[PDB]
């Protein structure tokens, strides 16, 4: 009875300590004693929320001798945490004093003027943009990740003969993280007149008016607003910039793309140095004018590739190579530990610049960004996998109307807009699909999340860092293992405080049958199990004891059914079982999972019986059996946004001949939140191919459709045109049958992307009314098509049609469209930026 009351006492202390950590993280002071206090309080907080979560699952399980013993153990653990809390207040009273109370840096950064390598083309691109443009004040924001070379390029642009000649007056302004607008205006005034003493009683409003007058005395002005960090900072400074219609220019450098977009909707994203240019800079910085010795040339290019074309990393390793001497063996040692020299051993130049973006991040985005360093360097992170991981870890806290996936996706967008995370792939609609963190930021993430905040720790067997012992595992919070998983698991590890187990490897490995239950046995408090890179031959009773599990992903080639004991994990949000079997049968009580959000699988999932309660948090059901698409199942899931059907879908589209209209496909139309629908066929031996139900049966809010092997006749594509909100339609091979494709007038009112693969299409007739918003139209391996309709050339929104090894007639039609469009553009028609790509150049050229 009183144990729950003691949990309230500990929780009250935890609110104070969590606020202490949040306030301490807002100011990175030089006080080392507070650095050790925050680390000690953080460890107690982490050990406290683990004990509280143990108490929560114990109370849920209870509402018997083993339960009594476990309750006594939890009470003893809570007592130890409470006693540890008292020691913090008894001994570290002064440390708490420094944070509950409250309380040179404006020197412009140094960037090399000479020996600038690889910016000749980028400078010319920006210069040609500054000279041209409209007649009012235009901003040309160069934007990139920390250390990219924005200020080096901006100073190069600031000093070319063409920029100096064209502009009447050019002014360099150093905005920073924190600045005073009064000082900026007085510095600009100081350049025109030296008597700045006379403005002591002049307000900033009349200072900006004075800067207006000074800049307006002549022609064009180029003002290099360096290191602008906020939308507001640009607004407060632009009031000093006159607009007299003389093609005045502003050259802004910033790490923020969203700030760049406001100034100009076409930000100039700075490029990274190539492998040749990266090596050129390294040899120019280490060996100065003298060339690199031949023995050191081979290791030198290796370390240049390690920087991934970032000038800041090249400059940092240049100092490391100078200090380490000039020997072949030392240079090869550096190439094996490049990350150490960037952050661990050189905090003076590189680490501070990285921390400028990091300490500005909101408190929730800090753990989100550090989590991106768990994945291996240079690896590609799926965006949907990353988002679900953030939600499972608890980094996304939200109570508004949006879904947690949309909030976490906004967090990913914020990181990308801050140039802390790269985007490598984008979906058809423009949503981020795959992202990757740069190398320098990955090492900073690992340094911050292992040696400062203990977010996660990696497991590897290097030259000296073998597998950690029991003492090290007693402090490890999150585990990130890439390879040698069975070898690590064979030693019977004992991590009682492990909250995550991320198998971040790429190649799948088969877990030995005798080591399958080792993951649940080692870490009873596992909250995330990212074992999608591990193939499991069987489930174990130890897996069903991970009551704290929220994210579980696992591959398998043998398991056909998810057992009923799997439903004992009521905390699970994401359930991924990537199986190579034809069918998967979920016997688990997934309906009891009140917080279930995603169920993903490659097989035909057979859902259990629903037998009031509603799964409000379920967003994705992915591929399920057609017979389970009942109106009762869809009743329990009102917020479903993605649905997939796999198998014999003739049980979905069949007419209920008993007299009613209750076909299983009609139940799908009752889902109001559905946005993406998938159908995959397996059975081809039907006497007649299936035909689509009427369009009013389809979900009206559907915005994407995908069909596989459905053998639909081309005549029933016009009914898909009656879908009001459809935007993406994709079809794989044999999804549509026939050679003649005809369309009615109108239809497809909002279609934007169309995808076809390996169909029997040979003749195609359409009309201009079917493509009011189409942008992408690919016909992969549809080499049997004769010619594209002439109405496609009239589609303004069309962007790209890509075909390889197509017919000669198709190539001729593409040539005619390109030639006629070019002639029309030469006659004053506005260009749509349409492009055609042919690979390789041997054919078609």
């Amino acid at each position: 009875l009183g144990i729950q009351g003691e949990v309230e006492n500990l929780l009250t202390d935890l609110n104070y300590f969590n606020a202490f950590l949040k306030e301490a993280a807002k100011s990175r002071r030089e006080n080392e004693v507070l650095k050790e206090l925050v680390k000690k309080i953080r460890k107690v907080v982490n050990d406290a929320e683990d004990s509280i979560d143990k108490f929560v699952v114990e109370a849920k399980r209870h509402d018997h001798i083993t339960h009594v013993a476990r309750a006594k153990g939890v009470a003893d653990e809570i007592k130890s945490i409470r006693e540890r809390v008292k020691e913090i207040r008894d001994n570290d009273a002064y440390g708490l004093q420094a944070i509950t109370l409250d309380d040179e840096e404006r020197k412009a950064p140094v960037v090399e003027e000479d020996d600038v390598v690889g910016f000749d083309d980028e400078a010319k691109t920006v210069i040609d943009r500054l000279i041209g443009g409209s007649d009012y004040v235009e901003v040309v924001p160069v934007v990139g990740m920390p250390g990219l070379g924005k200020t080096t390029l901006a100073y190069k642009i600031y000093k070319d003969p063409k920029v100096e000649y064209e502009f009447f007056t050019r002014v360099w302004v150093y905005v920073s993280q924190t600045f005073k607008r009064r000082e900026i205006f007085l510095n600009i005034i100081s350049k025109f007149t030296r008597n700045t003493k006379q403005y002591d009683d002049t307000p900033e409003d009349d200072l900006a008016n004075e800067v207006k007058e000074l800049l307006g005395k002549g022609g064009k002005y180029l003002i290099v607003l360096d290191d602008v960090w906020t939308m507001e900072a640009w607004d407060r400074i632009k009031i000093a910039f006159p607009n007299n219609g003389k093609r005045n220019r502003v050259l802004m450098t910033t790490r923020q793309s969203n700030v760049a977009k406001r100034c100009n909707d076409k930000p100039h994203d700075l490029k990274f140095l190539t492998k040749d240019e990266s090596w050129e800079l390294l040899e120019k910085k280490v060996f100065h004018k003298e060339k690199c010795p031949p023995e050191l040339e081979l290791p030198g290019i290796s370390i240049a590739e390690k920087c991934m074309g970032l000038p800041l990393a090249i400059v940092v390793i240049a100092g490391a190579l100078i200090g380490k001497g000039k020997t072949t063996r030392e240079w090869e040692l550096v190439a094996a530990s490049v990350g150490e020299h960037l952050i661990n051993r050189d905090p003076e130049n590189c680490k501070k610049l990285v921390q400028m973006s990091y300490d500005r991040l909101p408190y929730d985005l800090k753990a989100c960004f550090l989590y991106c360093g768990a994945f291996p360097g240079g690896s590609q992170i799926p965006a949907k996998k990353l988002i679900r991981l953030w939600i499972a870890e608890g980094f996304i806290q939200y109570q508004g109307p949006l879904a947690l996936e949309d909030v976490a996706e906004d967090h990913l967008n914020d990181l990308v807009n801050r140039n802390l995370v790269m985007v490598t792939q984008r979906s058809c609609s423009g949503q981020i699909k795959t992202c990757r963190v740069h190398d320098m930021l990955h090492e900073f993430c690992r340094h911050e999340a292992m040696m400062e905040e203990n977010l996660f720790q990696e497991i590897k067997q290097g030259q000296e860092r073998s597998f950690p012992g029991k003492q090290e595992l007693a402090t490890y919070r999150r585990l990130c293992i890439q390879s040698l998983i069975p070898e690590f698991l064979s030693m019977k590890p004992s991590g009682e405080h492990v909250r995550s187990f991320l198998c971040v490897g790429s190649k799948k490995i088969d877990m030995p049958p005798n080591e399958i239950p080792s993951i649940p046995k080692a870490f009873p408090l596992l909250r995330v199990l990212d074992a999608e890179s591990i193939k499991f031959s069987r489930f174990s009773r130890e897996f069903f004891k991970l009551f704290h599990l929220r994210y579980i992903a696992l591959s398998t080639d043998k398991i056909k059914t998810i057992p009923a004991d799997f439903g004992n994990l009521w905390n699970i949000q994401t359930l991924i079982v990537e199986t190579q079997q034809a069918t998967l049968d979920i016997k688990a009580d997934i309906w009891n999972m009140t917080r279930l959000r995603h169920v993903c699988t490659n097989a035909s999932a057979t859902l259990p019986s629903t037998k009031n309660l509603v799964n409000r948090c379920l967003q994705t059901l992915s591929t399920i059996a057609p017979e389970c698409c009942t109106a009762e199942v869809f009743t329990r899931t009102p917020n479903l946004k993605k649905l997939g059907v796999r198998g014999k879908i003739d049980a979905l589209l069949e007419s209920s001949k008993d007299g009613s209209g209750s076909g299983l496909f009609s139940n799908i139309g009752k889902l109001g939140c559905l946005e993406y629908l998938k159908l995959v066929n397996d059975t081809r031996l039907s006497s007649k191919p299936l035909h689509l139900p009427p369009a009013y049966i389809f979900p009206q809010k559907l915005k994407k459709l995908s069909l596989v092997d459905t053998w639909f006749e081309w005549k029933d594509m016009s009914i898909l045109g009656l879908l009001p909100e459809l935007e993406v339609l994709k079809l794989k091979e044999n999804a549509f049958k026939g050679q003649s494709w005809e369309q009615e007038d109108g239809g497809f009112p909002r279609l934007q992307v169309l995808w076809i693969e390996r169909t029997d299409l040979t003749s195609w007739k359409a009309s201009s009314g079917n493509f009011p918003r189409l942008k992408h139209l690919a016909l992969i391996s549809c080499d049997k098509l004769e010619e594209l309709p002439a109405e496609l050339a009239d589609v303004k929104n069309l962007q790209l049609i890509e075909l390889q090894s197509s017919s000669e007639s198709a190539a001729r039609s593409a040539r005619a469209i390109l030639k006629r469009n070019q002639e029309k553009e030469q006659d004053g028609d506005k260009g749509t930026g349409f492009k055609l790509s042919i690979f390789p150049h041997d054919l078609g050229l």
């Binding site: 100096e164 007056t169 307006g216 005395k217 022609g219």
Partner: protein
């Protein structure tokens, strides 16, 4: 006793005591006991053997370093330092050496530079900067050694930019002052470890120091002679010769005359590839620096004519970039001439500029009254013209511009009621308003 009473601990100094000492010394009614308390404070620090670093922290807390040097608190710190040194000979420290032990001399150098910029602290920074060179001379540091050691934190190119160049060359004076026989080889290693331009930048600043003028001029001219014979474009050599940072006195500069003669020679040898002398000054010094160049040059009678040449090219450059006459009114600083502008010689040049602008660009042609009205209120024009018609000169300009304003009034259909309310309470406005009413009536009376 006063510490326990006026502090609860964690004071991080003795500011509560010192602020009241200043308060008591602010009036003669309590100065007698205020100095008694202050002398007790200094005696207490000496008896406890407080570190002078800690005592400076007490005086400095709550204000920036620049203001601390500018406050009487610095003088009290020097009084404490003298008492500490005299009473405790077992360990001593100078003002600059104690200062260096708290701020590394890199962070100290720009602190003394900043105190030199602030004219209030210029005298104090002068004595501190000299002692800093003394401690560098003791450690037997070469000027290059000082540069290399400080470059690890200042940046590679910082010492070749103002105001760091002046302080670094100033130490070359004190180095050569004690070592007159190694100045010549000092410039050789400077020209070897850096480029020709980086040598010229230091050489030009060295000519401002009397102890280095003879050697600096000898190296600069000989290095310039071997570069004029190369045949490179004078635009490139202008930047190499460090002529882009000479200052406002570039017209009296001796090296600049050498480049002008070379540029004229180059221009006549390449009549089809002529280069201009103005655009180099305009690019390097910017138009506001060109204005300062013109005024400073014209102040010296030995270069008045050449100051006229740059002014003519500057105003010609205005027509090339097509700056409207209404903006040249502001550019010539006629907006701050007040009233009675018609007698200002700058007004004559502005009208001449307007005549040339209209002649060269016959699309947007605007007369004088258009320029004045676009910059100055009509009320100020009434004042200006009434104060100009009474002069023995400029009556014709005043009368013509008054008529131009009268016609400009009826162009916008300005009824006399609106003009009367706008010009309320000002003299010299009713006389022209009566002329406007009589002109409006005459215009309306014509069939």
């Amino acid at each position: 006793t006063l510490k326990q009473r006026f502090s609860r601990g964690d004071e991080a100094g003795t500011d509560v005591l010192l602020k009241l000492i200043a308060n008591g010394k602010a009036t003669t009614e309590a100065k007698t006991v205020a100095n008694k308390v202050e002398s007790a404070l200094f005696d207490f620090w000496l008896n406890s053997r407080e570190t002078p670093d800690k005592v400076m922290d007490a005086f400095k807390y709550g204000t920036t370093t620049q203001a601390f040097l500018g406050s009487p608190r610095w003088k009290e710190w020097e009084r404490y330092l003298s008492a500490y040194n005299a009473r405790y000979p077992e360990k001593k420290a100078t003002a600059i050496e104690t200062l260096t032990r708290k701020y590394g001399d890199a962070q100290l150098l720009d602190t003394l530079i900043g105190a030199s910029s602030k004219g209030e602290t210029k005298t104090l920074a002068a004595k501190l900067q000299a002692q800093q060179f003394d401690r560098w001379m003791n450690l037997k540091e070469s000027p290059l050694d000082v540069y290399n050691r400080l470059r690890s934190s200042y940046g590679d190119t910082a010492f070749f930019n103002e105001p760091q160049l002046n302080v670094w060359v100033s130490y070359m004076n004190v180095f050569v002052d004690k070592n007159p026989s190694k100045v010549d080889k000092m410039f050789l290693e400077l020209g070897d470890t850096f480029g020709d331009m980086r040598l010229f930048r230091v050489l030009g600043e060295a000519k401002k120091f009397p102890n280095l003028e003879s050697t600096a001029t000898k190296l600069q001219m000989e290095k310039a002679s071997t570069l004029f014979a190369s045949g490179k474009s004078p635009e490139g050599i202008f930047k190499v010769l460090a002529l882009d940072n000479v200052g406002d006195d570039i017209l009296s500069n001796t090296l600049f005359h050498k480049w002008l003669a070379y540029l004229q020679k180059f221009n006549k040898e390449h009549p089809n590839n002529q280069e201009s002398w103005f655009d180099m000054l305009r690019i390097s010094y910017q138009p506001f620096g060109v204005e300062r160049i013109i005024e400073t040059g014209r102040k010296n009678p030995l270069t008045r004519l050449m100051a006229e040449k740059v002014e003519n090219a500057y105003h010609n450059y205005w027509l090339d970039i097509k700056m409207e006459p209404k903006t040249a009114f502001r550019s010539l600083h006629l907006d701050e001439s007040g009233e009675k502008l018609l007698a200002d010689p700058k007004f004559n040049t502005w009208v001449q500029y307007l005549k040339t602008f209209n002649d060269r660009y016959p699309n947007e042609k605007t007369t004088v009254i258009d320029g004045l009205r676009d910059n100055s209120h009509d009320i100020a024009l009434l004042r200006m013209f009434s104060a100009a018609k009474n002069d023995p000169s400029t009556e014709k300009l005043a009368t013509d511009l008054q008529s131009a304003l009268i016609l400009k009034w009826q162009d916008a259909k300005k009824t006399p009621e609106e003009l009367k309310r706008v010009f309320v309470g000002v003299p010299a406005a009713d006389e022209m308003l009566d002329r406007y009413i009589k002109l409006l009536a005459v215009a309306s009376s014509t069939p």
